[PDB]
Scaffold this active site. Structure first.
Site, PDB file in Angstrom:
ATOM      1  N   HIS A 106      38.425 -13.555  24.483  1.00 48.98           N
ATOM      2  CA  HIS A 106      37.959 -14.914  24.275  1.00 48.98           C
ATOM      3  C   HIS A 106      37.412 -15.134  22.894  1.00 48.98           C
ATOM      4  CE1 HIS A 106      36.918 -18.895  25.797  1.00 48.98           C
ATOM      5  NE2 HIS A 106      35.939 -18.835  24.895  1.00 48.98           N
ATOM      6  N   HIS A 123      37.566 -28.892  21.517  1.00 46.98           N
ATOM      7  CA  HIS A 123      38.540 -29.050  22.570  1.00 46.98           C
ATOM      8  C   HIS A 123      38.152 -30.138  23.480  1.00 46.98           C
ATOM      9  CE1 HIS A 123      40.271 -24.781  21.945  1.00 46.98           C
ATOM     10  NE2 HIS A 123      40.185 -25.484  20.814  1.00 46.98           N
ATOM     11  N   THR A 124      37.178 -29.884  24.351  1.00 47.94           N
ATOM     12  CA  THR A 124      36.601 -30.951  25.155  1.00 47.94           C
ATOM     13  C   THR A 124      35.939 -31.932  24.223  1.00 47.94           C
ATOM     14  OG1 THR A 124      36.137 -29.483  27.014  1.00 47.94           O
ATOM     15  CG2 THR A 124      34.976 -31.597  26.950  1.00 47.94           C
ATOM     16  N   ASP A 127      35.923 -36.068  23.558  1.00 49.77           N
ATOM     17  CA  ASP A 127      34.657 -36.781  23.609  1.00 49.77           C
ATOM     18  C   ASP A 127      34.472 -37.732  22.428  1.00 49.77           C
ATOM     19  OD1 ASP A 127      34.075 -35.302  25.924  1.00 49.77           O
ATOM     20  OD2 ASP A 127      32.625 -34.032  24.877  1.00 49.77           O
ATOM     21  N   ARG A 176      26.611 -41.386  21.882  1.00 45.23           N
ATOM     22  CA  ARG A 176      26.094 -41.413  20.526  1.00 45.23           C
ATOM     23  C   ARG A 176      27.143 -40.999  19.488  1.00 45.23           C
ATOM     24  NH1 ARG A 176      22.140 -35.979  20.646  1.00 45.23           N
ATOM     25  NH2 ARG A 176      23.924 -34.536  20.495  1.00 45.23           N
ATOM     26  N   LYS A 217      25.608 -34.988  29.038  1.00 49.32           N
ATOM     27  CA  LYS A 217      26.966 -35.437  28.724  1.00 49.32           C
ATOM     28  C   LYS A 217      27.086 -36.908  28.302  1.00 49.32           C
ATOM     29  CE  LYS A 217      31.539 -34.418  28.840  1.00 49.32           C
ATOM     30  NZ  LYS A 217      32.320 -33.215  28.450  1.00 49.32           N
ATOM     31  N   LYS A 241      31.516 -21.952  16.019  1.00 53.05           N
ATOM     32  CA  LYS A 241      32.795 -22.389  15.468  1.00 53.05           C
ATOM     33  C   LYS A 241      32.840 -22.548  13.922  1.00 53.05           C
ATOM     34  CE  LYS A 241      34.410 -24.452  19.801  1.00 53.05           C
ATOM     35  NZ  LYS A 241      34.574 -25.758  20.509  1.00 53.05           N
TER      36      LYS A 241
END
Ligand SMILES: CC(=O)N[C@@H]1[C@@H](O)[C@H](O)[C@@H](CO)S[C@@H]1OP(=O)(O)OP(=O)(O)OC[C@H]1O[C@@H](n2ccc(=O)[nH]c2=O)[C@H](O)[C@@H]1O
Lengths: 698, 11
Positions: A187, A590-591, A595, A574, A568, A512
């Site tokens: 991962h 990714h998610t 968003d 915002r 969430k 990241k």
């Protein structure tokens, strides 16, 4: 009753283990103990293969035995820890490790094993301390070096970054070649500069970890169905996830099982985790044809039977190598076709996985050699988001003019329109189009609420809610389980953003970011004088480090702003305050990608080689905004800067995103599902024809 | 404050 006899047998077993033949090693160890029961080292050695074989229960009993015989056996304490850990008894495992260190202060594995617990509890500064100690004691320790490297990654400690990277590669190279399981976790592999063969090879090895854990059940291959006759013409798809609950995976695809065509498909959901209580879990259970709680069935043998029992044609793995996964299920091969999907951003590297579900933007055919599975392409992107269903209050917005900006003070709500209609002087900018409230008593009331930090007010009877207090006004709406039943105000002053700035955001976990990625932003920020970068305390210990490196690249503190992590709904909402999102190219949002796009906020990306560094591009393509996709560092900076200076251009693109998020297929779960259904049937036809899986690239 | 669920390795 002879120690010498036994002693020789032990020597033999250790040999048999080296030549990878586990079966035999155990048989010998067991005979060594038959001859001489009070044999410490035999007990210890038989334990660790039992552990490898996943027979913990028993492996524990033998470790306990080893200790009783040799109270100074520090090595056995340490391992017993690992076992107890793997048995979800963290408490007792923690006790072992500390007990081991107390006995042998210099024993290095204990120090690492301890750090590893800290890592899993998410207390990182402590994990790091303990890894550093372990490495001091034994300066050649892969597991500890690699795990450390990952922590330093998470806090953005970038000391000796380049040497650290080279060193990693170096270690993995050695371990791949010496046929030893590599310290880097698949991962995380996407974060380092390894070869793609290397990455596949790592995955491959963790692939084999399950393989051994099931061999010891001695199960006959399963008879798979060959037609749809028993299931009445319906293809039986089975989703297997540990994240049918409050968790990104659900936030993405919770609608999908609901959206399948009942005529042609029968949906089975297999939860790997207990019911957490949330509405996500509820919807999925309510809407799948069948929902099976596999967390009640710890045994992988009986679980797999239960799948095969149900007559599944296509089994979908949503976990890959993530927390709570159980791939032993897949290794047992209960369905004829087994596909990777959505949940894990990488190859499984495993034989028992047939397809990976993706698309041409994310996994172009050039790079099919990265994966061990055959590619199955979706027609646009393989990604998807529930945002449309989860956050309908963000479809439309309205703004206050406090002096025409679209992202300074915002208002959303299901009943926004009727409230604007109550108001006397609203002005209607065209793009849909954006209502603007003028600076009146009303506007002043709202802004004073924000300023005094009050939970909510009432205007003409409508509830106006501070968009910082939603968890107080309605817990469920803040988590994304309910749709908010009021109007919510969101403003830059709430997060200490400068009202008249260009706000580049990135809301991802900080791991990241790497020194390159930061450099680029530094550049961008220098070329755009009215700008600020907006980041998250994720984790907070990360903040000082960035601040540090940011300062050495020549940025004043006030140039980078950190906000705390939010629930969430607030988090998504915002995003509307930001002007452009700047995407991490080492590993994409990714998610998060979904968003920020849902908020109507364009996102600059620079696609790389690894799947995970390509997802954002793939999302932007589907949306129809290729001008946001950079071919190199250089172009990345320029696209950003153009957006940040050319306010006309900025407005053009922002409006595009806003419109496109509805009209493109990206956030369209119904259309998405139907495509997924196509791809399913393609896979089926092909296998029913008598064929082993090949690429479905169409 | 508030912590939120995210993906992570198999440990
Ligand atoms: C690199 C990687 O692991 N990628 C995975 C994908 O491959 C998987 O497909 C996705 C799940 O299947 S998750 C994962 O995608 P990522 O974008 O990395 O999300 P990650 O694991 O960091 O968590 C972000 C969450 O915090 C929420 N979030 C964030 C900030 C905040 O303030 N509030 C908040 O609720 C966000 O809305 C999210 O709910």
């Amino acid at each position: 009753s002879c120690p010498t006899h036994a002693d020789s047998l032990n020597n033999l077993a250790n040999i048999k283990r080296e030549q990878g033949n586990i079966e035999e090693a155990v048989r010998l160890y067991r005979k060594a103990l038959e001859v001489f029961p009070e044999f410490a080292a035999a007990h210890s050695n038989l334990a660790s293969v039992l552990q490898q074989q996943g027979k913990l229960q028993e492996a524990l009993m033998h470790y306990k035995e080893a200790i009783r015989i040799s109270p100074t056996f520090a090595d056995a304490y340490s391992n017993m820890g690992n076992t107890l850990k793997e048995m979800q008894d963290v408490q007792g495992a923690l006790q072992c490790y500390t007990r081991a260190i107390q006995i042998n202060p210099a024993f290095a594995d204990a120090h690492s094993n301890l750090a590893s617990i800290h890592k899993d509890s998410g207390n990182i500064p402590e994990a790091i301390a303990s890894y550093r100690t372990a490495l001091k004691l034994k300066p050649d320790f892969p597991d500890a070096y690699c795990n450390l490297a990952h922590c330093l990654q998470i806090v953005c400690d970038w000391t000796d970054y380049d040497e650290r990277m080279k060193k990693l590669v170096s270690i993995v190279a050695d371990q791949l070649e010496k046929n030893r399981l590599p310290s880097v976790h698949p991962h995380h592999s996407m974060l380092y500069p390894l070869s793609h063969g290397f990455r596949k090879a790592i995955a491959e090895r963790h692939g084999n970890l399950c393989l051994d854990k099931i061999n010891v059940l001695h199960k006959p291959p399963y008879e798979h169905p060959k037609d749809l006759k028993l299931s009445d013409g319906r293809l039986r798809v089975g989703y297997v996830s540990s994240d049918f609950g409050n968790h990104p995976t659900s936030h993405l695809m919770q609608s999908i099982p609901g959206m399948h065509n009942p005529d042609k498909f029968e949906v089975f959901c297999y939860a790997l985790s207990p019911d957490d209580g949330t509405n996500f879990r509820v919807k999925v259970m309510a809407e799948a044809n069948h929902f099976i709680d596999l967390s009640q069935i710890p045994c992988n043998g009986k679980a797999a039977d239960r799948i095969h029992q149900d007559g599944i044609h296509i089994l979908v793995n949503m976990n890959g190598y993530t927390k709570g996964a159980r791939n032993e299920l897949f290794a047992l091969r209960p369905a004829p076709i087994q596909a990777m999907w959505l949940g894990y951003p990488g190859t499984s590297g495993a034989l028992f996985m047939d397809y990976i579900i993706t698309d041409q933007e994310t996994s172009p055919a050039e790079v099919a050699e990265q994966y061990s599975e055959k590619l199955a392409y979706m027609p646009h992107t393989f990604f998807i988001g529930d945002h449309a269903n989860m956050f309908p209050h963000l479809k439309k917005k309205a703004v206050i003019d406090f002096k025409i900006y679209d992202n300074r003070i915002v208002l959303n709500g299901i009943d926004l329109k009727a409230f604007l209609d109550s108001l006397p002087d609203v002005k209607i900018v065209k793009m849909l189009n954006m209502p603007v409230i003028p600076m009146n008593t009303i506007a002043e009331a709202v802004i004073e609420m924000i300023n005094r930090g009050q939970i909510q007010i009432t205007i003409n009877g409508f509830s106006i809610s501070n968009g910082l207090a939603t968890t107080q006004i309605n817990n469920k709406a803040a988590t994304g389980e309910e749709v908010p039943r009021t109007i919510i105000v969101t403003t830059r002053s709430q997060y200490g953003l400068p009202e008249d700035a260009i706000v580049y955001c990135n809301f991802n976990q900080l791991y990241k970011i790497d020194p390159s990625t930061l450099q680029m932003w530094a550049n961008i920020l220098k070329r755009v004088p009215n700008s600020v970068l907006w980041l998250l305390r994720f984790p907070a210990v990360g903040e000082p480090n960035i601040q540090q490196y940011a300062q050495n690249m020549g940025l004043p503190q006030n140039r980078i702003i950190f906000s705390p992590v939010a629930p969430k709904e607030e988090h998504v909402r915002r995003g509307q305050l930001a002007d452009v999102c700047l995407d991490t190219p080492l590993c994409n949002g990714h998610t998060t990608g979904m968003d920020v796009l849902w908020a109507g906020t364009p996102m600059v990306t620079m696609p790389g080689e690894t799947l995970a560094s390509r997802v954002a591009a793939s999302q932007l393509t589907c949306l129809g905004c290729l001008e946001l996709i950079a071919k190199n560092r250089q172009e990345y900076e320029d696209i950003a800067v153009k957006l940040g200076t050319d306010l006309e251009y900025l407005k053009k693109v922002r409006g595009k995103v806003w419109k496109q998020r509805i009209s493109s297929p990206l956030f369209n779960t119904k259309q998405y599902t139907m495509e997924l259904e196509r791809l399913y049937l393609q896979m089926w036809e092909h296998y029913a024809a008598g064929n082993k899986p090949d690429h479905m690239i169409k | 404050p508030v912590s939120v669920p995210y993906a992570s390795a198999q440990s």
